[PDB]
Structure formats: C-alpha cells, structure tokens
Amino acid sequence: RHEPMRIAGRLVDTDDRVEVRYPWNDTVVGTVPAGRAEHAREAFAIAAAYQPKLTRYERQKILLATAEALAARKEEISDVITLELGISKADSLYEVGRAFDVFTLAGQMCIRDDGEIFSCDLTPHGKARKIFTMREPLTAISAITPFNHPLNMVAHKVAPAIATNNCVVVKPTELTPMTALLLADILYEAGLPPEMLSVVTGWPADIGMEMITNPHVDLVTFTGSVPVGKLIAANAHYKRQVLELGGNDPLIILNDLSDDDLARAADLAVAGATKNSGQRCTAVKRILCQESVADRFVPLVLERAKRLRFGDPMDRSTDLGTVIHEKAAALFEERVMRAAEEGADILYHPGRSGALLPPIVVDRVPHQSDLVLEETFGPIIPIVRVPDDDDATITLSNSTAFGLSSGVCTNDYRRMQKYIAGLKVGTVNIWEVPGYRIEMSPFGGIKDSGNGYKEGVIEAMKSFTNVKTFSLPW
Amino acid sequence: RHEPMRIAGRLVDTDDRVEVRYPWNDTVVGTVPAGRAEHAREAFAIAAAYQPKLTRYERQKILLATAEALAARKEEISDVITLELGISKADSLYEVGRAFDVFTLAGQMCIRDDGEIFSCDLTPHGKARKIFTMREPLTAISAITPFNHPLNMVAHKVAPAIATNNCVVVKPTELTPMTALLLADILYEAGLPPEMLSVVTGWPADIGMEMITNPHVDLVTFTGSVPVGKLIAANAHYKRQVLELGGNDPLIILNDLSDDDLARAADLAVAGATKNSGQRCTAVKRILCQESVADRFVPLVLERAKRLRFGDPMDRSTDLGTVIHEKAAALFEERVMRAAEEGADILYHPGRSGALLPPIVVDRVPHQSDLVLEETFGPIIPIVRVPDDDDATITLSNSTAFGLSSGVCTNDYRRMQKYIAGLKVGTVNIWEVPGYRIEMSPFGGIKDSGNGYKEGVIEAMKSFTNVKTFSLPW
C-alpha cells in the first residue's frame, strides 16, 4: 500500500518514499512520501489562511460522525495500526475504542461555553460595568505524534482542534504514519472542511524542523521522547508549547494488603506493565513492593505473567504483540540481563524473538539499574523491593527524572493521602494502574515528563484558544 | 540613598554600583548593587531549597497586611516611584492604589480552591471511581519587571506567588529598581518568610541571563519590550514562559456619536494617551476617528489636552510628569516631527524640555508613520483619520504587529459586537480606554503583545502552580 500525504484534502505525492515495516516479520507493508520542509510549509500556509466558521452544532456533527466511522471501521483501522506498530489486535482494537471516546467526548464538549462574567464595582475605584470572557481559535496548530498510539494520539490532538475551530497540521512518526493518513480520510468524509487538517510525512531531518519553526504556528503540541521534546523546547521560540514526554510510572504495593488484595494488585501490575506491549507513557515500569509482602506478592505476579499469550499480533487470541522494532526489543532484554548481573532475579523469560518480547518477570531489581531508572518502553514486569517505610518508599518513587502518573494499592486512608500528597507526579491513582484516566480528565506530567501543561480533551480545547475579554457599561 | 540587594531577607551589597537617576533633572537619587550572575544564582538556590508551608489563612494575612502597609506608606512609596521614574505624584499615588488592589485581591483569592471532581463511569469501559484535582507550587519563579510600573508590576508577579506558596526572585530594571527593594522590605515586615522573596539588581549583561537560564527556575514571568521578550523566548528553553510585551492600542471613535458623546470620547482619548506619561502597555497610542466626525472630535481633544498641567513630578498639582529619560522623550518628539513632514498636523506642542514631554496633539497622522505604527511609549495624542467604514477601520486597527487591548466608542450594538468579534486583541472595552480592567480579570495579548498566556491575579495563580489529579475507588 502506497499512501500520499494529505494536504488540505489533496493527495500529495513525492518521488522518494519512506518504507513502513511490520515489526512482526520486518516486511514492508506500506509506503508514504519522504516529504520536505516545503510540504509542511504549504500545509501551514493553507492552515493560516483559512478561518473556520463552523457552528458548534456543525463541529459536533463532524466529531460524532467521525466517532461513528471509527466504530464502523474498527477492524480495518486496527489492522492498519497492528501492521505498522506490531501491537496485538486486542491492543489495537482497544485503541480504536479510545479514539472513539475522544471524538465522542470532544463532540459533546462543543455545547459548553466556559465564558465568565465579572462585576466591576469591587474596589473604591470600581465602575458600573461588566467584563465578559470568550474564546477564539489560533492561526495554526502544529501536532507531532508518537508511534505508540498511531490513532489515539492523533485523535487527542486533532479532535480538540476541530472542536475549537482551529486548523491543524499533523506529522506522525515515520515508523507509524499510515494510521494518521487514514484518520484524515475519515475526517474529510465526515464533513471536515479540508483546510482544517493536513497530515504530512517524511524523515525528521527533512520535514521535522519546519513543524517546530514555521512562522504561522501559534502552538506546538508534541508527545514523544525526552530528547526530541527538549529539542522542540529549544527551537519553538515564541510559540506556546504543550510537551508530553515519557513517564517511568510506579505501581506501589503497600504492606497492609491481604493475600486476596495482593492477587488483585498482581492483576494490575501485569496488565499495567504489559498493555500496548508496555508502550505507554503511563505504563507500569516500576513495581515498588514493600519488603514484608513481596514474598507473597511476587508468585502471584509470576503466575499471571505466565498466562499471557505473546506472539502473532494479527492472531485474535494473542494478548501481547511485538514492540516497535527489534532494536528496541534487544535493548530492553539487555537491560534485563544487566539488572540480573547487578543482583536481580529473572523469574520468567521464555526468550526473545526479533521484536517479540515476552512479558519478562524480574524480581529484586536494583532501583538504580538502567531497567527501572531509565524509561523502559516494553512489556517488562520489574519488581523493586522497597522498605516497609512510606517515607523511604516515596523518596525512592520520586528519585527518577520522571513524574507523570502512579498507582498505589492500599486500604489505609492515612497512607493513601500521604502518597497522594507526597508523590511528585501529575496523577495518583488509588487501586488502579498509573495509566488509568478518562479522556476528559486533566492529563500531563512534571519534571522530565512534561513542561507542565495539561492535556486531555477539555484542557486541550482551552490550550487551543485565546481568551478575549470585553466590557460593557452596566 | 544607597540600597543593597535583598537576598532572602539579607542585605547584600556589591562594590560597583548602578546609579539611579531622577529624569526630571537627571540627578542621582539612589544607588543599587551592580549584581552578578552569582547573586541571582544564590537567590535561586535558596528559593529552590525552601518549601513554603503557609496555610491559606497565613498567606491571606501576609497579603492583607502588605496592602495595609502600602496604604499607610503611600506617600513615601510614591515618592520613591516618582524620584526614579519621573511620573507625576498623581500617577505614582495612583500606582500605589493599584498595588493595594493587587495585594488585597490576591489575599481574598486565598480562600478559593478551584479543584474539580470527575465521575469515571462515563463510557462502556468506565470505572466506579472519582478523580479529584488539586494544585501544588513550583520549585522557583523568576520575575523580570519593567520600568513603567516600578511597584505594581512587581506586585502582579509577587502577590500571586505568595498566595500560591511559591518562592520568587525578582530582577527589576536598572532604571527603576528602588521601588522593588522597598516592597521586599514591606513584605518581610508583613510576615513573609524571607526565603520566598529575593530582589536582585544589576546590569542586563551581568545578571540578566541568569534570570532566564538558572536550572532551578520552573517559570519565567516577564513584562517588557518585544526585543527582550523574544530574547527570553529564545533562551528560556525547557521552562514555562509568561511574556507580556508592548501594545499599540487604539481608541476607536465611530461615526454614530452625538457631539456630547464626542466630548466624552475626547475625555477618554486624552486620559488614555496620557496617563502614566503614556507609559502603559495598554496606553492609547492610536486614536482612530472615523472621518465624518473628526472635524467635531479633534477640537474637543485639543481643548482637553491644553488643560493638562505638565511639569515638576513632585508638585501635587502636576498631571503629567516626565517620561523615563531624555533619550526616550527626544525619540518620541522626533516621530511627531516626521509624522508632520509626512502630512500630519501638529495642533498643540508647547515644546519639550529634557525628559519632559507635553501632551502633544497631532491630527491627520498617517497610519504608516513611525509615530503610530511603532509603539510610542509617551504622552502623544495622535489622531488617525479613518474611513467611515467599519471593515476598513477594523483592518487598519489590526494592521500593526501588536494585539493587546482596545477601546471602542459607539452606541450602536450591532457595530459594538462587530468590533468585539473583529479586533485581533486580548481585550475590547466599549466606552472605556484600552487600559481599563480590574486586577483579577484575565489580562494578556496576542501577536507581538504576548505569547498567549493570561495574567492578572487569578490567572497568575493558576500559572504559578501544577495541577495534580488523584483518583479513589468509589
């Protein structure tokens, strides 16, 4: 399958191609244009020149029709996702489900006007006057999207833009660009004025910088690696920046739990470490288990890990597909091996095959090992034994460069509140994985996980607008 | 008067001095340290290491006590402002009033918790769970303040930081640094833990960059010139930035107005162009008068301009003091002269003396002349005659690089709403000067006027925090 760029509804092709490979067998499944700065430049010019005038009703219609099209075409879309990313169909179908929610909730948010009113006779020198508040769209939005959610991460950037009468230009990663192109087609079909969306593709070295630098761009919204995020922050000079970078999120198991609770916690740990092949910013990447319950906890985790079916992503009975590519998979295995040399205990490792990593279980992981100190973006299930002391646990949890989300399992309210207050993260989930949220709750991290702005449909809609005030004599 | 820096309550001196001059007679009235990078660096380390734990009540107390001290010491504080800036006592006393409002309103905002609650059982794959929202302070805030409001612009940055349990380091301009030092003293006396505030001084070339670049700084808040703002945007890499730059704000006079209304509009025009010696980001800098009413409007403006008393800033009967320095005053006069060569009509110009510029009235100003195309930060009253056509007037109004505030005088609702929707600015005031606002309404511009974030006490408090969410089984 060869797919051209979508520039404001026009199919735009290029001589050189970028090959898209299925990580399961490293075969080419598609091709997209090796687009250049000029292509992004054109897309941005079209975006800047066009002023969306959709009514709130029209926007809701487009967004809800898009959701309906996602539901109707889910098997087809999830096929595209799996073929370029290598996650299981189970995982890619789930992703279509998320994108369906995003477009639905964005559509429903169209009916909301968060305008405020201020009375002005408030101080000795007030006036008989009212100030009113209103939102207007930007000139152009630049959206740069990651490989791990080839559909949903585009949705999270594009739906709020549409809902808010913005024009957006999307550049997906060269590893998984086809899903974005398909979504564009679906949007055009759902009635979106074509000028409001372009999807361009190419090598980072050709077209990447134009996405950061184009003079029409008022806001850059990016999800991806810390390095690339810091690079954007350094070059997107006088522009608003919404940067979501990695996480290194803990699932913390406290020593008040019964054996039944440990089993429930083990269920969360395995699912959390392993969904989407562990490729989530908010994946469980560190299981911090307090020492006194670790001996009962670890076997429960091992047992659940062994139940997971890993293999052919297109097989509907597969739980766990591949990671993004063999190089990533080999790197993750390497960190496991090194952790083991540093004192860790590999409990389950049926062996790696290419980009296919099994849900490896490792106990007694040293917290300073690369495996858990760096972000490891794969289905590793690593247990770090931590002291039966909350202060020390919290300190250890806070000791990485990251601060995105977290999960804490405990039934003791006092301890719950202590962790909620004490963890240095954007989100603390009690009795859920760090990845748990709804599409419209505020989402975003601190430290190296993000520059401190919130995402999610509602906050993104705010980010994508300028507030204008006006006052009238009253 | 020689004043040391205030570094976390400590008086810190330096051998080399920065001389502070009174623009009225160019005499030295004070001296402050020529601080270096190392001084800012120390201030930031102290800020980073300290974690404010004030209760909301305690913060309210400090903030309200500060307001009380501003009121009690207004004559003394306005003296300091006038002596370093050269604005009239009438303007500097007014400034103390604004700062009094800022601290008061910040104090009252302490009782507000804007936390939200989300129910999670919203989609097919919702959970019986609630998400809650909460705010936490940053590590350190860097505040860089302009010469035009030596007190109030420090207040707008510091009060919200206090209200929000943040530590802030302030570097005022070397032109007007003494007011900031005095405010710091007042704050310490009012009970502020000294670690929460430093005021450092020095030449831009010595200590300026450390304010942008220090690794502990989570957020830089700046008000000042477009060039300096763009410089900060270029160097404050992975940091939140709140940048408020200049305005070039219009007061627009529509042709539906009666002669009585023209008189009221003239009052606004003269006050707006002239308050604080015209040295406001939201000063009236362009009076756009529709042609058919210009012949009746202009004489009304002239008459009011001639009533202004300009001269010795310390004389209580002075309306209009000097501008910041003689170089600035000479530049502004030059632009008036050039505008006149290009077809403008100087109607009132009793002559410049040093930094003292009279409220010069100029009619038929070409909209492309430097006088009104550039930001002219002085008490010039420039009337640009515009077509009796709203579309053309709006286009002309939007034709500069700026977009901050605006005022429109008209009684026709349809036209009102057209301008409110059509002006590309952060604020549209109907029948008030562009400068009109309350201290807690959202304030900020677009285009070259600002990077798109809102200021004002309420929005600043939000900017100065990170939102943390947490979820509980429900």
**A1 vs A352: CA distance, rounded Å:** 29
The DSSP string of B120-131 is S--STT--SEEE
Paired residues of B136 in beta bridges: B466
HEC string for A309-328 = CECCCCCCCCCECCCCCHHH
Question: β-pairing, A361-363 with A465-473?
Answer: unpaired
Residue A134: phi, psi to the nearest 5? -155, 155
CA nearest neighbour of B278 among B301, B300, B246: B246
B269 close to B285: Cβ distance less than 8 angstroms: no
CB contact under 8 A, B467 and A451: no
Taking the CA atoms of B232, B236, B237 and B243 in sequence, report the sign of the dihedral they define.
negative
CB contact under 8 A, B438 and A218: no
Q: Which residue of B has its CA nearest to A472?
A: B430
CA distances from A19 to A148, A177, A179, A312, B263 (A): 18, 10, 14, 21, 71
A210 close to A142: Cβ distance less than 8 angstroms: no
How big is the A-B interface in CB pairs under 8 Å?
139
Q: In chain B, which residues have their Cβ closer than 8 Å to the Cβ of A164?
A: none
**B133 vs B439: CA distance, rounded Å:** 26
Which residues numbered 443-472 in A keep a CB inside 8 Å of some CB on B?
443-444, 446, 451-454, 466-472
Q: Which residue of B has its CA nearest to A117?
A: B441
Residues in contact with B80: Cβ distance below 8 Å, sequence separation at least 6, in sequence order: B150, B178, B179, B182
Task: Supply B256's token pair.
Answer: 């539906």
Query: What is the number of residues in chain A?
Result: 474
CA distance A430 to chain B (A): 5
Residues in contact with A95: Cβ distance below 8 Å, sequence separation at least 6, in sequence order: A78, A81, A87, A149, A150, A151, A152, A276
- B223 carries a ligand binding annotation: no
CB contact under 8 A, A430 and B133: no
Q: What DSSP state is assigned to residue A263? A: H
Question: β-pairing, B249-253 with B284-290?
Answer: parallel
CA nearest neighbour of A280 among A71, A73, A69, A427: A427
CA distances from A301 to A223, A237, A401, A406 (A): 31, 47, 27, 18
CA distance B125 to chain A (A): 9
Task: Supply B32's token pair.
Answer: 């402050």
Q: In chain B, which residues have their Cβ closer than 8 Å to the Cβ of A240?
A: 451-453
Spell out a b/e string for A143-168, using b for 16 or more CB atoms within 10 Å of the CB, else e. Answer: bbbbbbbbbbbbbbbbbbbbbbbbbb
Q: What DSSP state is assigned to residue A356? A: B
Task: Supply B412's token pair.
Answer: 């026709």
Question: β-pairing, B427-430 with B407-409?
Answer: parallel
Task: Supply B110's token pair.
Answer: 């302490």
Residue A288, classed as helix, strand or coil, is strand
Which residues numbered 211-230 in B keep a CB inside 8 Å of some CB on A?
218-219, 229-230
In order of start, what are the domains of chain A with their CATH numbers?
1-245+450-474 (3.40.605.10), 248-445 (3.40.309.10)
**B362 vs B95: CA distance, rounded Å:** 28
Helix (H) or strand (E) holding A267: helix A259-274
Q: Determine the residue among A133, A408, A438, A443 to mutate to test chain B binding: the one whose Cβ has the most chain B Cβ atoms within 10 Å.
A: A438
The DSSP string of B190-231 is TT--GGGEEE----IIIIIHHHHH-TT-SEEEEES-HHHHHH
Instruction: Tell me how crowded residue A246 is: count the other CB atoms within 10 A of its CB.
Output: 28
**A356 vs B220: CA distance, rounded Å:** 45
Q: In chain A, which residues have their Cβ closer than 8 Å to the Cβ of B467?
A: 426, 442, 444, 454
Taking the CA atoms of B433, B439, B441 and B442 in sequence, report the sign of the dihedral they define.
positive
Cα A374 to chain centroid distance, Å, stands at: 18
B284 close to B318: Cβ distance less than 8 angstroms: no
Q: What DSSP state is assigned to residue A443? A: B
Q: Which residue of B has its CA nearest to A443?
A: B469
**B473 vs B247: CA distance, rounded Å:** 50
A308 close to A320: Cβ distance less than 8 angstroms: yes
Radius of gyration of chain A (CA): 23
| Interruption sites in chain A after residues (C→N beyond 2.5 Å) | none
Paired residues of B244 in beta bridges: B223, B450
Instruction: Tell me how crowded residue B162 is: count the other CB atoms within 10 A of its CB.
Output: 29
Q: Of B131, B234, B428, which has the smallest distance from its Cβ to A441's Cβ?
A: B131
Among all chains, which residue has been given the structure tokens 């244009």?
A33
**A388 vs A56: CA distance, rounded Å:** 54
Extract the runs of DSSP E, i.e. beta strands, from A357-449.
361-363, 381-386, 402-403, 407-409, 427-430, 446-447
Q: Where are the alpha helices (DSSP H) in B73-88?
A: 74-85
Residue B175, classed as helix, strand or coil, is coil
End-to-end CA distance of chain A: 63
The DSSP string of B14-72 is -SSEEEEEETTTTEEEEEEE---HHHHHHHHHHHHH------HHHHHHHHHHHHHHHHH
Residue A197, classed as helix, strand or coil, is strand
CA dihedral B302, B304, B306, B307 (to 10 degrees): 170
Q: Of A127, A240, A470, which has the smallest distance from its Cβ to B428's Cβ?
A: A470
- Active-site residue list of A: 244, 281
CB contact under 8 A, A238 and B229: yes
Q: Which residue of A has its CA nearest to B120?
A: A438
CB contact under 8 A, A133 and B473: no
**B425 vs A115: CA distance, rounded Å:** 17
CA distance B418 to chain A (A): 12
Which residues numbered 115-154 in A keep a CB inside 8 Å of some CB on B?
118, 120, 122-123, 125-127, 129, 131, 133, 138
Q: In chain B, which residues have their Cβ closer than 8 Å to the Cβ of A135?
A: none
